[PDB]
Amino acid sequence: AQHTESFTSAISATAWSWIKVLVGGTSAFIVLGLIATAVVALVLFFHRH
């Protein structure tokens, strides 16, 4: 081979799209859970005050 292969040489645009969706979707879903937990804590605080 006249060239040099790299770790990401074979990752296609569609492969990156799926990786971004899986990483982004799971990350976004986690953040939604954390935000909802923090928001409800404030809702309960206002209930006492």
Next chain:
Amino acid sequence: DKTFPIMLNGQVNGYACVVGGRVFKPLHVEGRIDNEQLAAIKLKKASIYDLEYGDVPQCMKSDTLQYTSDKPPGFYNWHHGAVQYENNRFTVPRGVGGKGDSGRPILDNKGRVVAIVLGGVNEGSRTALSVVTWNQKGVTVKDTPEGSEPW
């Protein structure tokens, strides 16, 4: 009877009451309710308020206490006598109540439950009570004076 003692080894650890159609008891009270109709009920753990609750059986639906959120400053009644409520604080004279008295309800001049006692703080001649009450909008809240000891 609408209040039922909770006993673990034959000693009274706390009391349970039926308010609004639900059975209430504190989380820290161990033992079984003397009424088998209530003791057999699976209770949900509301750790937010240190209270266990369940649905009143149809056979026990008549033994339900009315509650209200209208709790103006004044004196209220409970199993140990009068209770004074002022400045958003529930207070009883020192020596009135103690360990084992958690879960008792506090009633107004119309017999409506306004609070459930969880514990209290001895403040000189008076003891402040930790109670579960409903705010001016009727939302359940937990009032806990600093250093309150569960009863």
